[PDB]
mmCIF file of C-alpha atoms and ligand atoms in Angstrom:
data_model
loop_
_atom_site.group_PDB
_atom_site.id
_atom_site.type_symbol
_atom_site.label_atom_id
_atom_site.label_comp_id
_atom_site.label_asym_id
_atom_site.label_seq_id
_atom_site.Cartn_x
_atom_site.Cartn_y
_atom_site.Cartn_z
ATOM 1 C CA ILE A 1 -7.130 188.763 -27.909
ATOM 2 C CA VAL A 2 -4.851 186.508 -29.642
ATOM 3 C CA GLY A 3 -4.556 186.416 -33.553
ATOM 4 C CA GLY A 4 -6.915 189.826 -34.051
ATOM 5 C CA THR A 5 -6.628 192.677 -35.859
ATOM 6 C CA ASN A 6 -7.019 196.607 -34.915
ATOM 7 C CA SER A 7 -10.791 197.723 -34.954
ATOM 8 C CA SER A 8 -11.974 200.801 -36.290
ATOM 9 C CA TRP A 9 -14.304 203.428 -34.537
ATOM 10 C CA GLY A 10 -17.938 202.410 -34.155
ATOM 11 C CA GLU A 11 -17.584 198.445 -34.391
ATOM 12 C CA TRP A 12 -17.645 197.536 -30.696
ATOM 13 C CA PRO A 13 -19.259 200.858 -29.350
ATOM 14 C CA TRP A 14 -20.167 198.890 -26.262
ATOM 15 C CA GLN A 15 -16.821 197.733 -25.475
ATOM 16 C CA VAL A 16 -15.749 199.636 -22.476
ATOM 17 C CA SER A 17 -12.136 199.355 -20.499
ATOM 18 C CA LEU A 18 -12.392 198.299 -16.642
ATOM 19 C CA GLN A 19 -9.304 200.529 -14.898
ATOM 20 C CA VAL A 20 -8.217 200.570 -11.371
ATOM 21 C CA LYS A 21 -6.171 203.749 -9.797
ATOM 22 C CA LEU A 22 -4.130 203.114 -6.794
ATOM 23 C CA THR A 23 -1.041 205.197 -7.268
ATOM 24 C CA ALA A 24 -1.070 204.100 -10.842
ATOM 25 C CA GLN A 25 -3.891 203.065 -13.750
ATOM 26 C CA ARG A 26 -4.391 199.889 -15.055
ATOM 27 C CA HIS A 27 -6.477 197.696 -17.646
ATOM 28 C CA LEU A 28 -8.140 195.003 -15.544
ATOM 29 C CA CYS A 29 -11.142 193.768 -17.711
ATOM 30 C CA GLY A 30 -13.429 194.069 -20.612
ATOM 31 C CA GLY A 31 -17.029 195.054 -20.015
ATOM 32 C CA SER A 32 -19.792 195.626 -22.332
ATOM 33 C CA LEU A 33 -22.431 198.514 -22.060
ATOM 34 C CA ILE A 34 -25.858 196.979 -21.647
ATOM 35 C CA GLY A 35 -28.216 200.457 -20.857
ATOM 36 C CA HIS A 36 -27.146 203.931 -19.992
ATOM 37 C CA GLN A 37 -26.090 203.279 -16.637
ATOM 38 C CA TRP A 38 -25.569 199.500 -16.559
ATOM 39 C CA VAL A 39 -21.887 197.427 -17.514
ATOM 40 C CA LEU A 40 -22.085 193.545 -17.617
ATOM 41 C CA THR A 41 -19.162 192.019 -17.012
ATOM 42 C CA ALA A 42 -17.259 188.642 -15.477
ATOM 43 C CA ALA A 43 -17.715 188.177 -11.313
ATOM 44 C CA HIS A 44 -14.067 186.807 -11.467
ATOM 45 C CA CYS A 45 -12.806 190.879 -12.055
ATOM 46 C CA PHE A 46 -13.834 191.680 -8.710
ATOM 47 C CA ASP A 47 -11.939 189.034 -7.320
ATOM 48 C CA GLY A 48 -8.856 190.520 -5.271
ATOM 49 C CA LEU A 49 -10.126 193.879 -5.529
ATOM 50 C CA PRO A 50 -10.236 196.998 -3.140
ATOM 51 C CA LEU A 51 -13.549 198.850 -2.756
ATOM 52 C CA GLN A 52 -15.051 199.959 -5.765
ATOM 53 C CA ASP A 53 -13.787 203.722 -5.795
ATOM 54 C CA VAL A 54 -10.811 202.711 -7.205
ATOM 55 C CA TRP A 55 -12.191 201.935 -10.900
ATOM 56 C CA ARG A 56 -12.196 204.259 -13.686
ATOM 57 C CA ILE A 57 -14.540 203.043 -16.639
ATOM 58 C CA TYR A 58 -13.675 204.257 -19.927
ATOM 59 C CA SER A 59 -16.209 204.021 -22.975
ATOM 60 C CA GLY A 60 -16.028 205.731 -26.145
ATOM 61 C CA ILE A 61 -12.333 204.871 -26.358
ATOM 62 C CA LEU A 62 -10.424 202.929 -29.059
ATOM 63 C CA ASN A 63 -6.985 203.342 -28.197
ATOM 64 C CA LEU A 64 -5.808 203.133 -24.334
ATOM 65 C CA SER A 65 -2.692 204.873 -25.305
ATOM 66 C CA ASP A 66 -5.427 208.213 -26.380
ATOM 67 C CA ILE A 67 -6.206 208.218 -22.634
ATOM 68 C CA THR A 68 -4.991 211.299 -20.415
ATOM 69 C CA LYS A 69 -5.799 212.424 -17.184
ATOM 70 C CA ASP A 70 -8.623 214.837 -18.898
ATOM 71 C CA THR A 71 -10.321 211.768 -20.558
ATOM 72 C CA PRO A 72 -13.832 211.386 -19.099
ATOM 73 C CA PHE A 73 -14.726 208.223 -17.642
ATOM 74 C CA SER A 74 -17.604 206.488 -15.152
ATOM 75 C CA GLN A 75 -17.557 205.661 -11.594
ATOM 76 C CA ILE A 76 -18.999 202.787 -9.642
ATOM 77 C CA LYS A 77 -22.808 203.130 -7.684
ATOM 78 C CA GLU A 78 -23.263 199.698 -7.053
ATOM 79 C CA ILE A 79 -21.575 196.280 -8.098
ATOM 80 C CA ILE A 80 -24.057 193.043 -8.430
ATOM 81 C CA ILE A 81 -22.362 189.973 -8.346
ATOM 82 C CA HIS A 82 -24.286 186.736 -9.197
ATOM 83 C CA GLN A 83 -25.211 185.609 -5.418
ATOM 84 C CA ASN A 84 -24.255 182.087 -6.600
ATOM 85 C CA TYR A 85 -20.299 182.982 -7.878
ATOM 86 C CA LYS A 86 -17.987 180.806 -6.060
ATOM 87 C CA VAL A 87 -14.268 181.684 -7.014
ATOM 88 C CA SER A 88 -13.183 178.468 -6.928
ATOM 89 C CA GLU A 89 -15.653 176.764 -8.349
ATOM 90 C CA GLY A 90 -16.599 179.298 -11.409
ATOM 91 C CA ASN A 91 -20.281 178.882 -12.165
ATOM 92 C CA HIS A 92 -22.392 182.041 -12.671
ATOM 93 C CA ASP A 93 -19.307 184.261 -13.796
ATOM 94 C CA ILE A 94 -21.515 187.412 -14.165
ATOM 95 C CA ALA A 95 -21.996 190.749 -12.520
ATOM 96 C CA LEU A 96 -23.176 194.173 -12.943
ATOM 97 C CA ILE A 97 -22.038 197.457 -12.362
ATOM 98 C CA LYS A 98 -24.071 200.484 -11.963
ATOM 99 C CA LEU A 99 -22.517 203.580 -13.007
ATOM 100 C CA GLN A 100 -22.801 207.169 -10.590
ATOM 101 C CA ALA A 101 -24.504 208.676 -13.959
ATOM 102 C CA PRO A 102 -25.881 207.778 -16.911
ATOM 103 C CA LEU A 103 -24.242 207.877 -20.420
ATOM 104 C CA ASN A 104 -25.316 209.660 -23.418
ATOM 105 C CA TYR A 105 -25.358 207.497 -26.504
ATOM 106 C CA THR A 106 -23.348 208.258 -29.463
ATOM 107 C CA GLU A 107 -21.973 206.519 -32.481
ATOM 108 C CA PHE A 108 -18.910 205.414 -30.527
ATOM 109 C CA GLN A 109 -21.216 204.680 -26.781
ATOM 110 C CA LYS A 110 -24.053 203.045 -27.023
ATOM 111 C CA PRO A 111 -25.596 199.660 -25.449
ATOM 112 C CA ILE A 112 -25.234 196.096 -27.052
ATOM 113 C CA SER A 113 -28.550 194.077 -27.599
ATOM 114 C CA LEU A 114 -29.637 191.176 -25.455
ATOM 115 C CA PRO A 115 -30.563 187.818 -26.079
ATOM 116 C CA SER A 116 -33.810 186.347 -24.895
ATOM 117 C CA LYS A 117 -34.244 184.168 -22.097
ATOM 118 C CA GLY A 118 -33.680 180.320 -23.425
ATOM 119 C CA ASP A 119 -32.031 181.061 -26.826
ATOM 120 C CA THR A 120 -30.223 178.783 -28.503
ATOM 121 C CA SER A 121 -27.402 178.838 -30.969
ATOM 122 C CA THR A 122 -26.845 177.655 -33.413
ATOM 123 C CA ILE A 123 -28.242 180.862 -35.436
ATOM 124 C CA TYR A 124 -24.908 182.244 -34.427
ATOM 125 C CA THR A 125 -22.887 181.492 -37.425
ATOM 126 C CA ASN A 126 -20.701 184.732 -36.754
ATOM 127 C CA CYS A 127 -19.311 185.304 -33.443
ATOM 128 C CA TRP A 128 -16.585 187.929 -32.549
ATOM 129 C CA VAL A 129 -14.899 188.737 -29.548
ATOM 130 C CA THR A 130 -12.882 191.774 -28.427
ATOM 131 C CA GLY A 131 -10.629 193.116 -26.068
ATOM 132 C CA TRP A 132 -7.398 194.726 -24.787
ATOM 133 C CA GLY A 133 -6.064 191.497 -23.574
ATOM 134 C CA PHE A 134 -2.619 190.192 -24.358
ATOM 135 C CA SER A 135 -1.947 189.059 -27.910
ATOM 136 C CA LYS A 136 0.096 186.005 -26.877
ATOM 137 C CA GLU A 137 0.013 183.612 -23.573
ATOM 138 C CA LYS A 138 2.680 185.869 -21.386
ATOM 139 C CA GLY A 139 2.164 189.259 -23.309
ATOM 140 C CA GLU A 140 1.642 192.303 -22.490
ATOM 141 C CA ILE A 141 -2.171 194.571 -22.769
ATOM 142 C CA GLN A 142 -2.741 196.158 -26.385
ATOM 143 C CA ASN A 143 -3.493 199.437 -27.388
ATOM 144 C CA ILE A 144 -6.194 199.418 -30.124
ATOM 145 C CA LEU A 145 -9.170 197.538 -29.329
ATOM 146 C CA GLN A 146 -8.697 194.211 -31.084
ATOM 147 C CA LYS A 147 -11.087 191.962 -33.040
ATOM 148 C CA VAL A 148 -11.522 188.268 -33.659
ATOM 149 C CA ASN A 149 -13.904 185.790 -35.568
ATOM 150 C CA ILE A 150 -13.998 182.573 -33.906
ATOM 151 C CA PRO A 151 -16.805 179.975 -34.304
ATOM 152 C CA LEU A 152 -19.321 178.617 -31.567
ATOM 153 C CA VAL A 153 -18.512 175.114 -30.135
ATOM 154 C CA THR A 154 -20.917 172.719 -29.151
ATOM 155 C CA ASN A 155 -21.219 171.853 -25.225
ATOM 156 C CA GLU A 156 -20.668 168.103 -25.949
ATOM 157 C CA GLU A 157 -17.322 169.288 -27.738
ATOM 158 C CA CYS A 158 -16.409 171.649 -25.243
ATOM 159 C CA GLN A 159 -16.408 169.681 -22.786
ATOM 160 C CA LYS A 160 -14.304 166.848 -24.046
ATOM 161 C CA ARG A 161 -11.732 169.388 -23.850
ATOM 162 C CA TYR A 162 -12.358 169.881 -20.328
ATOM 163 C CA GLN A 163 -12.521 166.538 -18.244
ATOM 164 C CA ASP A 164 -11.996 168.305 -15.077
ATOM 165 C CA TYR A 165 -14.934 170.965 -15.448
ATOM 166 C CA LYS A 166 -18.099 170.405 -15.725
ATOM 167 C CA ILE A 167 -19.526 172.659 -18.795
ATOM 168 C CA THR A 168 -23.751 173.610 -17.914
ATOM 169 C CA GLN A 169 -26.193 174.469 -20.126
ATOM 170 C CA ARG A 170 -25.333 177.873 -18.661
ATOM 171 C CA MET A 171 -22.300 178.567 -20.865
ATOM 172 C CA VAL A 172 -21.231 178.705 -24.232
ATOM 173 C CA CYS A 173 -17.952 177.663 -25.944
ATOM 174 C CA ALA A 174 -15.426 179.174 -28.593
ATOM 175 C CA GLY A 175 -12.785 178.517 -30.411
ATOM 176 C CA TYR A 176 -10.550 177.034 -33.519
ATOM 177 C CA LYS A 177 -9.320 173.352 -33.008
ATOM 178 C CA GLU A 178 -6.140 174.366 -34.520
ATOM 179 C CA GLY A 179 -5.766 177.433 -31.842
ATOM 180 C CA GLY A 180 -4.474 180.456 -33.058
ATOM 181 C CA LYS A 181 -6.972 182.592 -32.221
ATOM 182 C CA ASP A 182 -8.880 183.891 -28.664
ATOM 183 C CA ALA A 183 -8.864 185.892 -26.217
ATOM 184 C CA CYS A 184 -6.970 186.097 -23.111
ATOM 185 C CA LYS A 185 -5.637 187.763 -19.579
ATOM 186 C CA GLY A 186 -6.926 191.137 -19.690
ATOM 187 C CA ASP A 187 -10.150 190.442 -21.783
ATOM 188 C CA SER A 188 -12.358 188.889 -19.112
ATOM 189 C CA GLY A 189 -15.760 190.133 -19.000
ATOM 190 C CA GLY A 190 -15.726 191.513 -22.190
ATOM 191 C CA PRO A 191 -18.157 190.846 -25.020
ATOM 192 C CA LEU A 192 -18.874 187.505 -27.353
ATOM 193 C CA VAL A 193 -21.069 189.389 -29.932
ATOM 194 C CA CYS A 194 -22.794 187.292 -32.791
ATOM 195 C CA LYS A 195 -24.189 189.043 -36.095
ATOM 196 C CA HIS A 196 -27.605 187.915 -37.165
ATOM 197 C CA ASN A 197 -29.792 189.792 -39.990
ATOM 198 C CA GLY A 198 -27.574 192.775 -39.550
ATOM 199 C CA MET A 199 -28.189 193.353 -36.154
ATOM 200 C CA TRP A 200 -25.417 192.507 -32.941
ATOM 201 C CA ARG A 201 -26.655 190.492 -29.877
ATOM 202 C CA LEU A 202 -24.200 189.611 -26.780
ATOM 203 C CA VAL A 203 -23.699 186.158 -26.447
ATOM 204 C CA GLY A 204 -21.278 185.424 -24.222
ATOM 205 C CA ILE A 205 -19.125 186.917 -21.519
ATOM 206 C CA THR A 206 -15.486 185.876 -21.750
ATOM 207 C CA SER A 207 -14.899 183.538 -18.734
ATOM 208 C CA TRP A 208 -12.013 181.216 -18.939
ATOM 209 C CA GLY A 209 -9.873 178.770 -20.544
ATOM 210 C CA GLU A 210 -6.783 176.709 -20.314
ATOM 211 C CA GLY A 211 -4.154 179.251 -21.217
ATOM 212 C CA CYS A 212 -4.842 181.075 -24.559
ATOM 213 C CA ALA A 213 -5.104 180.120 -28.174
ATOM 214 C CA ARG A 214 -3.818 176.134 -27.623
ATOM 215 C CA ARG A 215 -4.620 174.024 -29.801
ATOM 216 C CA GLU A 216 -8.127 171.657 -28.520
ATOM 217 C CA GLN A 217 -8.869 174.171 -26.047
ATOM 218 C CA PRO A 218 -11.667 176.424 -26.780
ATOM 219 C CA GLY A 219 -12.637 179.420 -24.721
ATOM 220 C CA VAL A 220 -15.404 179.123 -22.283
ATOM 221 C CA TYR A 221 -18.017 182.242 -22.023
ATOM 222 C CA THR A 222 -21.092 182.745 -19.374
ATOM 223 C CA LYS A 223 -24.091 181.911 -21.787
ATOM 224 C CA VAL A 224 -26.295 185.926 -21.434
ATOM 225 C CA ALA A 225 -29.756 184.168 -22.620
ATOM 226 C CA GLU A 226 -29.586 181.804 -19.371
ATOM 227 C CA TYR A 227 -29.059 185.214 -16.826
ATOM 228 C CA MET A 228 -31.754 187.277 -18.700
ATOM 229 C CA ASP A 229 -34.147 186.499 -16.104
ATOM 230 C CA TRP A 230 -31.177 187.418 -13.574
ATOM 231 C CA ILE A 231 -30.237 190.777 -15.673
ATOM 232 C CA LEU A 232 -33.955 192.200 -15.699
ATOM 233 C CA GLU A 233 -34.864 191.118 -12.362
ATOM 234 C CA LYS A 234 -31.335 193.268 -11.044
ATOM 235 C CA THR A 235 -31.933 196.145 -12.897
ATOM 236 C CA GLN A 236 -35.623 196.542 -12.212
ATOM 237 C CA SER A 237 -34.747 196.308 -8.619
ATOM 238 C CA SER A 238 -32.131 198.302 -8.602
ATOM 239 C CA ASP A 239 -33.722 200.756 -10.895
ATOM 240 C CA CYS B 1 -9.141 183.285 -8.994
ATOM 241 C CA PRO B 2 -7.974 180.039 -10.614
ATOM 242 C CA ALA B 3 -5.566 179.759 -13.498
ATOM 243 C CA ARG B 4 -7.946 179.172 -16.210
ATOM 244 C CA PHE B 5 -9.662 182.924 -15.994
ATOM 245 C CA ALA B 6 -8.401 185.601 -17.626
ATOM 246 C CA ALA B 7 -7.869 188.578 -15.118
ATOM 247 C CA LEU B 8 -4.205 189.085 -14.521
ATOM 248 C CA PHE B 9 -3.871 187.710 -11.141
ATOM 249 C CA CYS B 10 -5.512 184.671 -11.662
HETATM 250 N N1 MRZ C 1 -10.545 182.317 -23.776
HETATM 251 C C1 MRZ C 1 -9.242 182.115 -22.896
HETATM 252 N N2 MRZ C 1 -8.117 181.341 -23.446
HETATM 253 N N3 MRZ C 1 -9.456 182.797 -22.060
HETATM 254 C C2 MRZ C 1 -10.833 183.688 -21.596
HETATM 255 C C3 MRZ C 1 -10.243 184.606 -20.803
HETATM 256 C C4 MRZ C 1 -9.698 184.545 -19.096
HETATM 257 C C5 MRZ C 1 -8.139 183.886 -19.873
HETATM 258 C C6 MRZ C 1 -8.709 182.553 -20.795
#
């Protein structure tokens, strides 16, 4: 996250860190807890990965430097990548992770609410993106979970900044014309959440953008409402 | 994954 600040405990209790351990352990992506055994993230987080035994999913953690060999983590039972996701193309950048065991809910570990199928922003005027990703292009993973407030941009205006790519109705964009505040490398798969009437909901999944926090280059997110039929079907069928 | 994506080896 570029231009953000340090979060406090319990602000973002759905945020998870998706890490891998081969010989060394590293944070790769964010994700959102959406039910007791389900994390929602980006499909591109699985491109160029070994099989799932490598993953360690941390929840209820604010600071990655607080993680030790004894810190509990979740393991993966199932990965459900959208059937129509193709890496070169980048549409349908969405994936479900089923955990090996359900998590107990606490103030620091609980699920984000989901939108209804076929929902529109606006109504979303107060949106935030979180993660442990780089704080500048060519930066490094941050220790304390970062937060930043970013306005949604219309698909028409987002499209003008991305002549080579089609901005579809299944994407949502967010950013400042002057840049300076954005998701970045390592924020993939994490949440774009908006507070409406006191309650937070998951509006987007961090996906792509040109560099990080450049002027006139908004972040692009998978629009969760446009995949609600898929999320429900896949999680019901598995459960 | 293309460079526009945000995973560490895109
Ligand atoms: N929003 C930006 N700038 N991103 C999204 C996450 C991958 C890196 C590019």
